[PDB]
């Protein structure tokens, strides 16, 4: 089984509308000026 006709620019783009890393959960870090993942450790 192989594609019978080629995907259009536009088809392939509608296909990828869900294909994206989303913004990480992040929070105001140790009062050390850092920035860290939610629920993950401050680091020195």
């Amino acid at each position: 089984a192989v594609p019978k006709r080629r995907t259009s620019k536009t088809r392939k783009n509608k296909r990828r509308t869900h294909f994206k890393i989303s913004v990480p959960g992040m929070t105001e870090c140790p009062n050390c000026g850092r920035e860290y993942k939610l629920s993950h450790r401050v680091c020195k």
Binding site: K20, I21, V23, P24, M26, E35, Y36, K37
Partner: protein, 112 residues
């Protein structure tokens, strides 16, 4: 005025770089710096280095207020693609694209 820096011919595929870049775009410089630091994709350190350099020559070369900046724009473009191949069964070999990307970043402020 509002400043720019480019990382030309990086060995990451543009389809991949664009993923992080889309997170970064239009964000304030601090947020974007963070998101770059905490994002788990491979492009992140690279785009980190580039937003950083763009900010640096934004300060030294235009005496810009490094706090008030925004990521005016950011994007990757197709670079030259080094072409390799892997051997396959029955002696045939198949094409492989080691793609590269021109990452570009532009910090800004009060436009006029």
């Amino acid at each position: 005025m509002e400043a720019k820096a480019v990382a030309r011919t990086i060995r990451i595929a543009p389809r991949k770089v664009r993923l992080v870049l889309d997170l970064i775009r239009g964000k304030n410089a601090a947020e974007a710096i963070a998101i770059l630091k905490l994002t788990n994709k491979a492009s992140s350190p690279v785009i980190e280095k580039v937003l950083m350099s763009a900010l640096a020559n934004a300060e030294h070369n235009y005496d810009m207020n490094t706090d008030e900046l925004v990521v005016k724009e950011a994007y990757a473009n197709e670079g030259p693609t080094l072409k390799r191949f892997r051997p396959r069964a029955q002696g045939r070999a198949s094409a492989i694209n080691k793609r590269t990307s021109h990452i570009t970043i532009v910090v800004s402020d009060g436009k006029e």
